[PDB]
Amino acid sequence: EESQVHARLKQIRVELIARIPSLRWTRSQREIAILIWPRILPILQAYDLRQSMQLPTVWEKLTQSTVNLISDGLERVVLHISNQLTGKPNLFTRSRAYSIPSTRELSQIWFNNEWSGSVKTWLMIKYRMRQLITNQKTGELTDLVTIVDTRSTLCI
């Protein structure tokens, strides 16, 4: 029973076996380790589909190019707010004056931080999974398996 679910799971199994032949190795004689969720925490940075994935890249460039056009204006906005509310231009920078991060700096350190590549990869994974769930609920029953086959990180 549940013929379609088994079809999809058997497809995922045969693809996993094909990409990694050592998965057939039984009795754990292989060097591949099967880990449930809580035990994959120190490896989440390694699961990165940087290639064969372009939407997060376009999103990052679009956000950067949009932020770069308003950073200096926003700095002027807060400068004027401080100058009106105190009469001095260092209302917001008194405690920190160090480094005053503008909107451009905020965007740069949000996109160039650690976990940024992981958060782009998992955003793509979630987007594709939700698309597949919507397609399955509608009843397409075709092409419901996505393979990214990225080097060093295979995801189905």
Next chain:
Amino acid sequence: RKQIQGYLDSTRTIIRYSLEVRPLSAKKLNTVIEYNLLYLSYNLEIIEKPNIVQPFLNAINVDTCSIDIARSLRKLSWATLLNGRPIEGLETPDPIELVHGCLIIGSD
């Protein structure tokens, strides 16, 4: 009666039940689906290029108080409904723009 009807929870399961037992029309279905695109298209008329506007709007400047601009904007926005009659009892000064503060330090 509006308040009692607003006492309803409006939960995801409740919304799904409402959509099931009372399906939306095709036009309503499409508008709910493409609300985002319609909203962006609606903004495209104001955030794209300088449109040709009535001339008395040149009196309003960036130096005009926000309350005056709010009066003019509400008068012009509901012009079809109100036919030029004013709206009263609404406007309240913006907190930051109302106060002209001054911090006194030592010999200041």
Next chain:
Amino acid sequence: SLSQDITNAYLNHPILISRLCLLPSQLGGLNFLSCSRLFNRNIGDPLVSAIADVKRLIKAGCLDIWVLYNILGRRPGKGKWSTLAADPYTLNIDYLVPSTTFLKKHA
């Protein structure tokens, strides 16, 4: 969507994205945080605060004065006598309410 003209128009021009994101919500934008909201929780009339923040962005250089003129000269939306009284401080500007509220009201 079959037609991607709107999405392409917004994607190919990040200046449009910036203008929309800096526009206060009450005027049709997505900037739901006001400059006065940094200090006061109680805001009173939100349209006056939105106009003040539009003025601040215009004088700094984030927005342009012709954006304010376009908003003032905007053609009135589809509003009734019920809409002016159900939620005051609001303009006759279409699409100001999300589809989430529409789904809640339909339920």
